[PDB]
Amino acid sequence: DYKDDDDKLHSQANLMRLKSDLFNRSPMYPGPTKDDPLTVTLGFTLQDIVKADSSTNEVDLVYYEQQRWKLNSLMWDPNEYGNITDFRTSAADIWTPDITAYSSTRPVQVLSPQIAVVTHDGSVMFIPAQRLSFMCDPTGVDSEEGATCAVKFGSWVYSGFEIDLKTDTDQVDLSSYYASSKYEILSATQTRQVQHYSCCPEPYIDVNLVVKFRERR
Amino acid sequence: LHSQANLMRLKSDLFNRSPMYPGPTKDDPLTVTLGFTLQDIVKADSSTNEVDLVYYEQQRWKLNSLMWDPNEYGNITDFRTSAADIWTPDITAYSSTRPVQVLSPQIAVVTHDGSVMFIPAQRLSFMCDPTGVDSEEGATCAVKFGSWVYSGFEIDLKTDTDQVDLSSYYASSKYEILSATQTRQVQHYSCCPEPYIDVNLVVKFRERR
Amino acid sequence: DDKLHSQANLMRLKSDLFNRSPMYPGPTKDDPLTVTLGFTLQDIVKADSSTNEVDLVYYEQQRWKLNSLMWDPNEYGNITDFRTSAADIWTPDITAYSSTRPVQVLSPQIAVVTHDGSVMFIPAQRLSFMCDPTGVDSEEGATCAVKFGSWVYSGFEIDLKTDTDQVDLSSYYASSKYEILSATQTRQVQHYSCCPEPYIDVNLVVKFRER
């Protein structure tokens, strides 16, 4: 009837009003600073090792990367907006961290829509699915001990004074690993590292993804 | 000329004169009907366990904000529009290995009751072991489709049939289809209280001899 | 004077047509449109018998005619036509029905508009499509076919036509790996069980063999 449709129009109007208040009526978040640093939580879900090229020492992974962070500027009171407690939004409408693989050999291919979820406490969750080619020698992959490769993920432009990274666990989520992959996973870890480079006095933070794998027999 | 003016006026009223639809919510949910028409298994790569399908995916949904009265617009009952002018659902394959390649123009049909129909043709690479494809029983592969970001409380999926449409399947494909089904599934994940919905596409196929 | 005036007249004409008139929203059942299609086949680049895909290079002449693009040349310094970005105008959504890869566009997206309202648009394309090349290494060669038509409009909104059923082969690459034995382009009226309206396509049929 009318009243059901009216409720739906009101819920839409509340959401449109909330997004307008947050985005159109506030300068966009200029990113973290030394005085206002930000912690980004990263977690990997490895779906498949698609290919290991021993002629070029490149390996191709398919995974999704959970990214979470929290901004005061994205907070609201649900009671002021019809009890809206979260919403979906284009990743282009918000600031997102510039988390980059440090040893890719090809631009990352994006396999999922660029949409994030924002919650009323200001927390953002963004889960890009990706295919990554990275530097990896697959020697030993046809052996019982398998091959080991590693790739670091972190901000390309922010030091540890502006962006800290963490993981919720050092165990990579392997529960959705493709059971009929050409490669089986012996272990996969994701470990926060504090790095010093000779160029720079400031510390840099990365998450090191280490995968040990071999040919499935 | 009046029919053109009426259509231009209708599109202007819907699009230019209404704040853009922010997507479905718990309070304003949406059902998307999905159906597959499989045209070709182009390639089955046993060196990487990837298979490439060509298909078109019929997507239908309905928005109150896209409704109009035909009598107010010269008895226009529907129109074609760029898919960029409207909200579209983020239906995603859960086990692709490459970005989907779009093979058809990004245009939808909107009807006066607010229903939208959008039929993207696609080439998809997905995770699939083709072992057995050179046998009578063939190989079986599966891939799930659903929203990447919305739970079942915002977007429900359904199919009109569990039979994949094979009436357009390429007769000289390298592979013949033994069966193809499309089935709604309700899943829970430990992170989350809400249900998640997918459609599971299951294809059994073998080398054409 | 004259060259400055011809420029000024053209700028004025384009402004009058584009900036000062609501844009054509496409055809409808009440206001249907004829689109003429013709193919010029330049090259069969590749025939892959491991996947049954063939790659063609061709250009597709598309013609249609709109009242809203008409003008009187006498009101615009005897300008009888002009070139314009295909993004400035409506263009038909003509699609191959059995491609296996996105079409690669090889020419600039520019159309010619004439004072009688006729539009001509000639996109050059590389297309991979479903094709079994069995027989290509024989005297009789192989035969493949691909249908082209609107993706979203029925025969009640867009009627598709050809000026001839002969594909233009006068630009076919003489040192191609493949020679063309015949190439035809034929209008077809199709009924599908989903739908009461007729659908129109042009069926491109190419018979070819190794040179």
Next chain:
Amino acid sequence: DYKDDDDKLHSQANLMRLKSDLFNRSPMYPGPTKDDPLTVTLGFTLQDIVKADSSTNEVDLVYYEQQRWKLNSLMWDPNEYGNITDFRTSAADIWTPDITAYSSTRPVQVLSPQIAVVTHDGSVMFIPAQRLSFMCDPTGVDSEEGATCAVKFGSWVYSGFEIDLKTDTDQVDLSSYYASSKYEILSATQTRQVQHYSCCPEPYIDVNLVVKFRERR
């Protein structure tokens, strides 16, 4: 010097003013007409034959194409703009000619920034570097006389009544040709042609690039 700093500020202000006068304050050039035709000068500099594929009869060239033309609407008096005699601008800010290879088999890949130089007399110079795949039978490439291939370049949509082409020379510039290419160049010419096609009563102009090449020994 403070005067030196002031001059620099003024030169910047003058250039911004000039670009604003030309671009923001004038209807954009709608292209040539039968009454107001345009001559484009083309020259090719061939850098490399990268690949000659005899399984598909496609050859891949890397070259840059100098394009020059002149518009009355891009003229200014240097004395009105602090003696600015030219400027660099994004090729997206100006009209550029639709010069197209007639027998490419793949979209051209652009290897250089899309920036042109405009001079006060209204002349424009634009030098896109490109990788082109085109139709070419490389039979004979492993012989003393080598293989010969040809590709025509011209407007896709304008006849010779609206766009004329010319070359300053019929010799392709070979002074940048890669000395350790897989292929050596025996000759490379660029020749203006006036062509009649049965479709069309107006004549069409192209520049025919003819390259004779063989495997380097």
Next chain:
Amino acid sequence: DDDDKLHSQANLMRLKSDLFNRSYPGPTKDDPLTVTLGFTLQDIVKADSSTNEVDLVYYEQQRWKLNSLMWDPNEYGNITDFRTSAADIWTPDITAYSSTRPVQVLSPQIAVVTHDGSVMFIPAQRLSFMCDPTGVDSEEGATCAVKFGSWVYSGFEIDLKTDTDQVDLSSYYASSKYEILSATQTRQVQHYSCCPEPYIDVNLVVKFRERR
């Protein structure tokens, strides 16, 4: 605590607005610019002797300085630098002179601006370029070279320099198929027949062989 954070954000938003929304057409003969280049070579991924193309992965440090990007930190809560989209600022059109494919960009297009007006931009890239790998399976290895410079500006508008002639090899992939015997980056001044003005490039010269 929260107020300080809001103020630091407001100061940065204000600084970016002052610099960008409330004010560079590129260098000119009257207002020339020096760009410093340095290369960090990460991997020789592939050396194709059938086409004489080699593929490198590296990052290229670019540095330059503009008066129009200067500010006083004391007027903006002691902000001494900030990160910004490379689309918000002018960037130099530094181009490889002998690429055979469009460069693939491997890093986000974000730069760091410092209060003295200096900009640092470090694009990571995969480049295919013209290179004969003959001798790569020998002790002396192969040598290839590629020049980088502006595509549209002469030495009257853009000068280049390097901070060192040694390419940074400290990030070179230890299990690459190729080992680096040497890698240098050298400024060159060129005169061409077409043109009276000088042209500047940085010549990257790499000697490499199969890891054995």
